[PDB]
């Protein structure tokens with residue numbers, strides 16, 4: 579089982595300037611709850627973007643994809659190919675744009691957080707993968723974050 583988990587603006591934007599262009603602490607808790615105790619896979623850029631206090635993310639086996647054979651990621655398993663990364667039975671791909679696109683075909687689940695923020699795509703942005711008709715989904719109720727932004731959760735699947 580390979581799953582993808584991400585938070586996106588309605589526009590599809592998930593990253594800009596090496597960051598996540600919004601604040602939504604409630605999403606942090608959701609991400610943690612889904613991924614806790616499992617293997618997580620991320621691209622090297624996503625690894626770099628992790629705040630040092632949570633690098634590596636606790637209680638999870640951190641796997642980092644990089645083309646540099648000798649890249650140093652303390653507390654994480656550096657692998658050079660997708661096949662080396664997706665070996666665990668329950669793997670959660672946690673970003674970024676390049677890795678989501680790379681792992682989507684191996685995925686049978688997507689846990690998505692839509693953030694109701696006006697944020698038109700700009701060149702160079704990290705973007706969420708687009709889910710086609712092979713996916714069946716359930717949409718949750720809109721909720722207000724203490725940061726003022728509305729957000730809702732989607733759970734997609736395919737067999």
Ligand SMILES: NC(=O)C1=CN([C@@H]2O[C@H](COP(=O)(O)OP(=O)(O)OC[C@H]3O[C@@H](n4cnc5c(N)ncnc54)[C@H](OP(=O)(O)O)[C@@H]3O)[C@@H](O)[C@H]2O)C=CC1
Pocket residue numbers: 583584585586591592593594595596597598620621622623624625627643644645646649657658659660672673674675676677678680704
């Ligand atoms: N909103 C959300 O849910 C999330 C948003 N983000 C945001 O996404 C952005 C980062 O995304 P993005 O730039 O797309 O980067 P990625 O996180 O997807 O990392 C890309 C890197 O992964 C490695 N890589 C990619 N393909 C391969 C391959 N086929 N084999 C080996 N290594 C490979 C490379 O490492 P190298 O260059 O070392 O070879 C590459 O530079 C940031 O802005 C971040 O904040 C990240 C996660 C979640």
Ligand SMILES: CC1(C)N=C(N)N=C(N)N1OCCCOc1ccc(Br)cc1
Pocket residue numbers: 583584585598605606608609624627628629632671672673691
């Ligand atoms: C966007 C986020 C978090 N939430 C969803 N639903 N899915 C993601 N893949 N997540 O990104 C994971 C990589 C960055 O996560 C962290 C974790 C803790 C801190 Br502190 C800062 C960043």
